[PDB]
């Protein structure tokens, strides 16, 4: 919509606020395709390395790849807590 995420926001911030802001903004961004597993998805994706996400979120083959992978991983734990 306006004023999208920028590496600057994290550049002028601590190593804690990073995952906070980034993950917080990525939470909804993931819901675009997985509004259910958006949580776990953003969680693992935020663990690997926030920096990587700041460069992966700028690509379709990457974004969809991460989301898909994550969701696939949760397949072992639980999908919608209905098992």
């Amino acid at each position: 919509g306006q004023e999208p995420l920028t590496a600057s926001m994290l550049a002028s911030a601590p190593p804690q606020e990073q995952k906070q802001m980034l993950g917080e903004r990525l939470f909804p961004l993931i819901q675009a395709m997985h509004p259910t597993l958006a949580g776990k998805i953003t969680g693992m994706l935020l663990e690997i390395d926030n920096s990587e996400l700041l460069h992966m979120l700028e690509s379709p083959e990457s974004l969809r790849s991460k989301v898909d992978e994550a969701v696939a991983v949760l397949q072992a734990h639980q999908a919608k807590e209905a098992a």
Partner: peptide, 19 residues
């Protein structure tokens, strides 16, 4: 994520939700 699959036990993050 790295080679094929990743860990699901990986904690989420540090949100700003208290109450």
């Amino acid at each position: 994520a790295f080679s094929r699959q990743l860990n699901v036990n990986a904690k989420p993050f540090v949100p700003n939700v208290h109450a």
